[PDB]
Amino acid sequence: ADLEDNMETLNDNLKVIEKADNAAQVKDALTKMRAAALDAQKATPPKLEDKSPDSPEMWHFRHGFDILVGQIDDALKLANEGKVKEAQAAAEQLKCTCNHCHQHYR
Amino acid sequence: ADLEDNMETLNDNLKVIEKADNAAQVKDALTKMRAAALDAQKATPPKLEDKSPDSPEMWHFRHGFDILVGQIDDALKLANEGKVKEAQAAAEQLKCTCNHCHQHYR
Ligand code: HEC
Ligand code: HEC
Ligand SMILES: [Zn+2]
Ligand SMILES: [Zn+2]
Ligand SMILES: [Zn+2]
Ligand SMILES: [Zn+2]
Ligand SMILES: [Zn+2]
What we know:
2 copies of one chain form a homodimer. By secondary structure, chain A is an all-alpha fold.
């Protein structure tokens, strides 16, 4: 999928987690976010003029998704333990990772 | 100053901005935050075992302070224009930069 689709997958599933009732719903949404993050990691920021994979800012761009995936994995551990409220709170901590990349690249 | 002092300078002055009344108070606090950020940029994260300046994660650590300084400079432009409420809102956007580095390194 393209970057827009991957970001809206992240966006919609974060909301699903917030409104979820049980561990299975949270797990399903986090699983979809993880795949969307790794897919988006292959894209480039539109406003970044230098697209070279070896450039510092492309390393930083991909690094940001590795951090996001790590946080998603933290939340998945809680969801797999059945800790719904805890997993929802962990998903809340994602938001500053989203907002940070956005401010930096958009 | 050491890392602890620099972080509490950032911490206390962010609160000063939130409670400020005029552009001069906001400007003074942002100016102190900027210096504290550049000083902290010379430190290393305690829990990072590899301290080599050329390592990717030390590049990332220093990069995070350059981003923070850029955001402080955005807020300073508004404060120097007398736009108090706008500068306070810009200081609010700093928080995800703080929280992101913290989650990543602490
Ligand atoms: C964390 C969970 C999130 C969430 C919820 C979103 N993102 Fe991102 N994002 C990144 C870039 C470069 C863009 C610009 C895309 C473009 O200009 O084409 C975006 C954009 C978005 C949107 C807006 C989509 C739109 O309609 O324009 C949304 C809703 C969104 N994102 C959600 C880059 C990154 C990251 C790189 C390291 C990370 C992490 C995130 N985004 C994280 C998130
Ligand atoms: C943005 C405006 C902020 C604010 C308000 C704070 N920081 Fe940081 N910070 C960083 C690291 C590596 C640490 C660990 C320090 C240690 O373990 O010795 C901290 C710690 C803090 C604290 C806690 C101080 C304490 O009493 O333990 C506080 C209050 C704090 N910070 C405020 C690293 C970074 C960054 C690197 C890129 C950035 C940016 C920030 N911090 C940003 C902020
Ligand atoms: Zn969209
Ligand atoms: Zn960068
Ligand atoms: Zn302290
Ligand atoms: Zn890093
Ligand atoms: Zn970063």
